[PDB]
A paper describes a structure:
Methylene‐tetrahydropterin reductases catalyze the reduction of a methylene to a methyl group bound to a reduced pterin as C1 carrier in various one‐carbon (C1) metabolisms. F420‐dependent methylene‐tetrahydromethanopterin (methylene‐H4MPT) reductase (Mer) and the flavin‐independent methylene‐tetrahydrofolate (methylene‐H4F) reductase (Mfr) use a ternary complex mechanism for the direct transfer of a hydride from F420H2 and NAD(P)H to the respective methylene group, whereas FAD‐dependent methylene‐H4F reductase (MTHFR) uses FAD as prosthetic group and a ping–pong mechanism to catalyze the reduction of methylene‐H4F. Mutational analysis of four functional amino acids, which are similarly positioned in the three reductase structures, indicated despite the insignificant sequence identity, a common catalytic mechanism with a 5‐iminium cation of methylene‐tetrahydropterin as intermediate protonated by a shared glutamate.
For the analysis, Mer from Methanocaldococcus jannaschii was chosen as only the enzyme from this organism can be heterologously and functionally produced thus allowing mutational analyses. For structural comparison with eMTHFR and hMfr, the crystal structures of Mer from M. jannaschii (jMer) with and without F420 were solved. Crystal structures for the apoenzyme of jMer and the binary jMer‐F420 complex were determined at a resolution of 1.8 and 1.9 Å, respectively. The overall structure of jMer is almost identical to those of previously established methanogenic enzymes characterized by a (βα)8‐ or TIM‐barrel fold. The same fold was also found in the structures of MTHFR and Mfr (Gehl et al., 2023; Guenther et al., 1999). The active site of jMer is located in a cleft between the α/β‐barrel domain and a helix‐bundle subdomain composed of five helices. The apparent K m and k cat values of jMer are in the range of those of the respective enzymes from methanogenic archaea (M. barkeri, M. marburgensis, and M. kandleri) and sulfate‐reducing archaea (Archaeoglobus fulgidus) (Ma et al., 1991; Ma & Thauer, 1990a; Ma & Thauer, 1990b; Schmitz et al., 1991; te Brommelstroet et al., 1990).
Numbering used by the authors:
A (entry chain A), B (entry chain B): 1 to 329
Write the structure that this text describes.
């Protein structure tokens, strides 16, 4: 089992560089940085991280086709790959309507746009002069001067829905699924396989990654309490099918929704229950978390991403995962 | 007279960082990095430059509203300003049709779009929650979490045309004019002044920058020969009015145009003449260049940007400008 780590660049970049180097020292193999217009710029953060690291793979987790031209995304990735000596990965998903509403961007045909953007990005990274008359993406004579070090930079698709999961099976090197529980992967991974089989691919060529809420502490209950804020947001944002799959109490989900939309975070967290914590986070002592990670592997997960909060104290939790979780997996 | 320096990030970023640190050591006050999708990413380059420098102001020269959301541009600038301790500058212009044709981007109302984008970027950088119903740019509830250190990051507009120059006079902190000869500023600066007066502003609040082709060498003729390739491109791309102002031989301009569009650089360079070099570059010994810079200051130029080639050898020329040009001005 390979481990990744996820951060929002919402603190000074020097602090983030400390966390990622600490993660590298502790045997994490992937560093995923979120890409939201309101925070520190993802590629500037990744440049600093590359300068402070040596071996960990790193990239946006995830960017999207809309906030920058896919041609800009390609050369940003090539730049990262050069600086890092061949360690770049491209995490890319469809984005979200709330963001694009605020920025005045039309969310055109997200599944098609993501596929066409990935094809164009890969052709540019391969050094091709690109003429591409897509249904959405239209390129006429574009060519990079900047070149990656890797022959093919791996592309990980953010995928939550069936059509996106099947598309990832056909074209992606990895899949970032926002889930933490085996039931979710029992359902998701067959859809990826359907796409792999349609494309004549083996699942061996696809890294199925759990983009998980993780909270690890020597005290199981402190780990549980630290996962509550993130789980509140995950439950509030979960589609019906996910809430049905885990038997979540919908009246509690509505209480969380109302509290979050007025910013009453204490009130929202009051409504998180044990069912929600077991469904939407990997939490507990190291021994607890190792067992949970094993049951995800049994469903076909091949990368676990230690996502927020990581633990009650991120510094402490990164070290504890490195000493008593990663070596066991 | 303040000095800037311009680079294309078309080599490994470490080499660029050496040049910019060398420029800082030699008394340059501004560093302008070009923003084109085919090269290394401008903000990744600027991050590395910021880490290798201390005092020089730095930013894109120039970005545009189209290749990234203006909200992304705002947080990229804020991120740069934070990393650099308050040294960011935002160079921004309209872009160009050739690029946007290749990327599938419609070049909507260049002057209006640039004005609205600047207004939005400034409101975002000021910490405002932005609802902006522009003729082109439409923002609904966007807000940054990242903050610059400067209260107002200076905005320099790239401006070549009359409407853009007048707009820059009304709204910009500085103007980047792609010209090297006093005749061009004699014509341009009154248009900026027209806008400043319409907005009730003093020209004291506007840094008029000559975004110049510069070539300095202890041997005047080596300096002249090093300027030929850039001057060939400037002459080929100049609007009629500029070629008319300098009495350029249009037949040589056409020979240059045909050679460049087939990539015959030797043939294009054969057609560059003394008239073109005097009109489109600041070249010669340090003594020559000092006098030429003084005649630009007399027209109202307050920053000279040492643009490509800088000299026959960039390292040698940066040092020579620092020792025998900047101190004299």
């Amino acid at each position: 089992m390979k481990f990744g780590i996820e951060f929002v660049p919402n603190e000074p970049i020097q602090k983030l560089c400390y966390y990622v180097k600490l993660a590298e020292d502790n045997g994490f193999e992937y560093c995923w940085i979120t890409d939201h217009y309101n925070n520190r710029n993802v590629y500037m953060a990744l440049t600093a991280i590359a300068m402070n690291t040596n071996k960990i793979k790193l990239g946006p987790g995830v960017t999207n086709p809309y906030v920058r031209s896919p041609a800009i995304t390609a050369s940003a990735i090539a730049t990262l790959d050069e600086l890092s000596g061949g360690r770049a990965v491209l995490g890319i998903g469809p984005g979200d309507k709330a963001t694009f509403d605020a920025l005045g961007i039309e969310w055109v045909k997200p599944v098609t746009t993501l596929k066409e953007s990935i094809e164009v990005i890969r052709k540019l990274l391969a050094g091709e002069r690109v003429s591409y008359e897509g249904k959405v993406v239209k390129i006429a004579g574009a060519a990079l001067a900047v070149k990656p070090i890797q022959k093919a930079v791996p592309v990980y698709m953010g995928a939550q829905g069936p059509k996106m999961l099947e598309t990832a099976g056909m074209i992606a090197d990895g899949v970032l699924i926002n889930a933490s529980n085996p039931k979710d992967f029992e359902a998701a991974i067959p859809l990826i396989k359907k796409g792999a089989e349609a494309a004549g691919r083996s699942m061996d060529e696809i890294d199925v990654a759990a983009y998980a809420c993780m909270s690890v502490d020597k005290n199981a209950d402190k780990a549980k309490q630290a996962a509550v804020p993130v789980v509140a947001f995950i439950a509030a944002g979960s589609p019906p099918v996910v809430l049905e799959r885990h038997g979540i109490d919908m009246e509690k989900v509505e209480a969380i929704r109302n509290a979050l939309k007025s910013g009453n975070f204490p009130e929202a967290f009051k409504n998180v229950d044990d069912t929600m914590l077991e469904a939407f986070s990997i939490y507990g002592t190291p021994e607890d978390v190792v067992e949970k990670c094993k049951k995800l592997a049994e469903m076909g997960v091949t990368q676990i991403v230690a996502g927020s909060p990581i633990g009650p104290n991120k510094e402490t939790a990164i070290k504890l995962i490195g000493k008593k979780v990663i070596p066991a997996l």
